[PDB]
Enzyme design. Structure first.
Site, PDB file in Angstrom:
ATOM      1  CG  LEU A  43      -9.872 -17.444 -28.934  1.00  0.00           C
ATOM      2  CD1 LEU A  43      -8.602 -17.069 -29.692  1.00  0.00           C
ATOM      3  CD2 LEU A  43     -10.270 -16.317 -27.978  1.00  0.00           C
ATOM      4  N   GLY A  44     -13.660 -19.424 -30.888  1.00  0.00           N
ATOM      5  CA  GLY A  44     -14.572 -19.519 -32.019  1.00  0.00           C
ATOM      6  C   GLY A  44     -14.564 -20.936 -32.568  1.00  0.00           C
ATOM      7  N   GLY A  46     -15.649 -23.237 -36.413  1.00  0.00           N
ATOM      8  CA  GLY A  46     -15.988 -23.245 -37.837  1.00  0.00           C
ATOM      9  C   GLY A  46     -16.555 -24.605 -38.242  1.00  0.00           C
ATOM     10  N   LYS A  47     -16.695 -24.840 -39.557  1.00  0.00           N
ATOM     11  CA  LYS A  47     -17.121 -26.143 -40.054  1.00  0.00           C
ATOM     12  C   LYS A  47     -16.058 -27.191 -39.703  1.00  0.00           C
ATOM     13  N   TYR A  48     -14.767 -26.815 -39.844  1.00  0.00           N
ATOM     14  CA  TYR A  48     -13.642 -27.750 -39.918  1.00  0.00           C
ATOM     15  C   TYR A  48     -12.588 -27.543 -38.816  1.00  0.00           C
ATOM     16  CB  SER A  49     -10.721 -25.630 -37.217  1.00  0.00           C
ATOM     17  OG  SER A  49     -11.031 -24.284 -37.522  1.00  0.00           O
ATOM     18  CD  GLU A  50     -14.642 -27.019 -31.147  1.00  0.00           C
ATOM     19  OE1 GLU A  50     -13.961 -27.404 -30.173  1.00  0.00           O
ATOM     20  OE2 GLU A  50     -15.901 -26.928 -31.147  1.00  0.00           O
ATOM     21  CE  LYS A  66      -7.942 -23.637 -39.248  1.00  0.00           C
ATOM     22  NZ  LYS A  66      -7.322 -23.049 -40.473  1.00  0.00           N
ATOM     23  CG  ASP A 154     -12.644 -18.922 -47.378  1.00  0.00           C
ATOM     24  OD1 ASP A 154     -13.770 -18.565 -47.785  1.00  0.00           O
ATOM     25  OD2 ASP A 154     -12.477 -19.436 -46.228  1.00  0.00           O
TER      26      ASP A 154
HETATM   27  C1  LIG Z   1     -12.469 -19.077 -35.991  1.00  0.00           C
HETATM   28  C2  LIG Z   1     -11.565 -17.928 -35.562  1.00  0.00           C
HETATM   29  C3  LIG Z   1     -11.141 -17.024 -36.721  1.00  0.00           C
HETATM   30  O1  LIG Z   1     -12.370 -17.190 -34.587  1.00  0.00           O
HETATM   31  C4  LIG Z   1     -11.802 -16.186 -33.825  1.00  0.00           C
HETATM   32  C5  LIG Z   1     -12.788 -15.484 -33.133  1.00  0.00           C
HETATM   33  C6  LIG Z   1     -12.432 -14.468 -32.259  1.00  0.00           C
HETATM   34  C7  LIG Z   1     -11.089 -14.140 -32.062  1.00  0.00           C
HETATM   35  C8  LIG Z   1     -10.393 -13.188 -31.233  1.00  0.00           C
HETATM   36  C9  LIG Z   1      -9.072 -13.345 -31.461  1.00  0.00           C
HETATM   37  N1  LIG Z   1      -8.861 -14.352 -32.401  1.00  0.00           N
HETATM   38  C10 LIG Z   1      -7.562 -14.682 -32.894  1.00  0.00           C
HETATM   39  C11 LIG Z   1      -6.378 -14.057 -32.456  1.00  0.00           C
HETATM   40  N2  LIG Z   1      -5.206 -14.284 -33.052  1.00  0.00           N
HETATM   41  C12 LIG Z   1      -5.202 -15.139 -34.073  1.00  0.00           C
HETATM   42  C13 LIG Z   1      -6.364 -15.794 -34.514  1.00  0.00           C
HETATM   43  C14 LIG Z   1      -6.335 -16.807 -35.604  1.00  0.00           C
HETATM   44  C15 LIG Z   1      -5.210 -16.942 -36.414  1.00  0.00           C
HETATM   45  C16 LIG Z   1      -5.216 -17.771 -37.522  1.00  0.00           C
HETATM   46  C17 LIG Z   1      -6.349 -18.500 -37.856  1.00  0.00           C
HETATM   47  C18 LIG Z   1      -6.379 -19.357 -39.109  1.00  0.00           C
HETATM   48  O2  LIG Z   1      -7.335 -20.159 -39.265  1.00  0.00           O
HETATM   49  O3  LIG Z   1      -5.449 -19.213 -39.953  1.00  0.00           O
HETATM   50  C19 LIG Z   1      -7.475 -18.377 -37.042  1.00  0.00           C
HETATM   51  C20 LIG Z   1      -7.466 -17.548 -35.935  1.00  0.00           C
HETATM   52  N3  LIG Z   1      -7.551 -15.551 -33.915  1.00  0.00           N
HETATM   53  C21 LIG Z   1     -10.112 -14.858 -32.780  1.00  0.00           C
HETATM   54  C22 LIG Z   1     -10.452 -15.883 -33.661  1.00  0.00           C
END
Ligand SMILES: CC(C)Oc1ccc2ccn(-c3cncc(-c4ccc(C(=O)O)cc4)n3)c2c1
EC number: 2.7.11.1
Length: 330
Positions: A43-44, A46-50, A66, A154
């Site tokens: 999905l994405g 960062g610096k410190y996670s995938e 994560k 943040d």
């Molecule tokens: C790095 C992250 C935020 O990137 C994405 C990018 C696109 C999408 C599309 C859906 N998501 C998604 C869906 N449901 C939950 C989450 C999620 C939940 C928590 C965290 C966290 O850290 O706390 C990071 C991501 N995420 C995305 C997350």
């Protein structure tokens, strides 16, 4: 040395809790079974996670995993403890589980799935009402976490997930969050540049929950004025200059005097002298439909140098900007 400061609200909330609530170094992490999840797609990063979409094969629920890049065990414990303490709170992301890859020993946090609409596509659709509504939803999460003795540290659009169809919002990425303790000197090297409070930029370490309220104000400005980021600094020094060109240098120097802050000499060259600007200079025909007296009054009361004079989350929620939202929620 600098003059000390205490939070105006929720000052002693952690002192009154059992030690285990805040003493996260002593927390023992309960690891679940990695084999319960199959990764579906990335999905994405960062610096410190995938971050991956996955499926829990025990019950076929969609979940988000994560996977942490290497970080100190204490910082992982901190994030886990905070997520567990805040679980069930309004608009807080739910941590469902915690697993380890058995071979590579990398830890992974497992979250509830939120169906996010691209926040980089969602700001051109937002009406005045929508902004008020979602701002109120963020304030519920911030009042809650502050009341629970936690600073997010943040707050920014990337850390707000919105499922627009369901008018649902979650505050995510608790990786920088910290417990508030009166007297504690915190790391100023937190938050994204554009959202950093003046306290961080001038190296005032005895900050509190009010940091989050500055960041929120930055978000609000960017949304109502259609200017992302609102304070666009080139680096941390220039970031304070960009703030000073709006809020003015008189109040900045008043703040530094009040707290006996020793300002980096580097700043003396670049800060100069600036008038406090009226908010009207950012209004234009494109953004005018988002801007009201109420919005500007509210914004003015978030964006203060002096962290002690910013609205609290609960005060913000009582502001006239939210009267329409409140009336509908019952
Ligand atoms: C790095 C992250 C935020 O990137 C994405 C990018 C696109 C999408 C599309 C859906 N998501 C998604 C869906 N449901 C939950 C989450 C999620 C939940 C928590 C965290 C966290 O850290 O706390 C990071 C991501 N995420 C995305 C997350």
């Amino acid at each position: 040395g600098p003059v000390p400061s205490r939070a105006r609200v929720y000052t002693d909330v952690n002192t009154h809790r059992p030690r285990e609530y805040w003493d996260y170094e002593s927390h023992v992490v309960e690891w679940g079974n990695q084999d319960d999840y199959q990764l579906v797609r990335k999905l994405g990063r960062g610096k410190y996670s995938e971050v991956f979409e996955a499926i829990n094969i025990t019950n076929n629920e969609k979940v988000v995993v994560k996977i942490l890049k290497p970080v100190k065990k204490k910082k992982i414990k901190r994030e886990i403890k905070i997520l567990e303490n805040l679980r069930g709170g309004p608009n807080i992301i739910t941590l469902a589980d915690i697993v380890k890859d058995p071979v590579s020993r990398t830890p992974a946090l497992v979250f509830e799935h939120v169906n996010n609409t691209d926040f980089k596509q969602l700001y051109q659709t937002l009406t005045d009402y929508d902004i008020r509504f979602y701002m109120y939803e963020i304030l519920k999460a911030l009042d809650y976490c502050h009341s629970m003795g936690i600073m997010h540290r943040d707050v920014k659009p990337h850390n707000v997930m919105i499922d627009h169809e369901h008018r649902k919002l979650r505050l995510i990425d608790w990786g920088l969050a910290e417990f508030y303790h009166p007297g504690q000197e915190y790391n100023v090297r937190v938050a994204s540049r554009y959202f950093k409070g003046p306290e961080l930029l001038v190296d005032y370490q005895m900050y509190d929950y009010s940091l989050d309220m500055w960041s929120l104000g930055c978000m609000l400005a960017s949304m109502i004025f259609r200017k992302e980021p609102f304070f666009h600094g080139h680096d941390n020094y220039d970031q304070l200059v960009r703030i000073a060109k709006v809020l003015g240098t008189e109040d900045l120097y008043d703040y530094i005097d009040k707290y006996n802050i020793e300002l980096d000499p580097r700043f003396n060259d670049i800060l100069g002298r600036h008038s406090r600007k009226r908010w009207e200079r950012f209004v234009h025909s494109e953004n005018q439909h988002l801007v009201s007296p109420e919005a500007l009054d509210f914004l003015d009361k978030l964006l203060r140098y002096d962290h002690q004079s910013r609205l609290t989350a609960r005060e913000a929620m009582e502001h006239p900007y939210f009267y329409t939202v409140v009336k509908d929620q019952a």
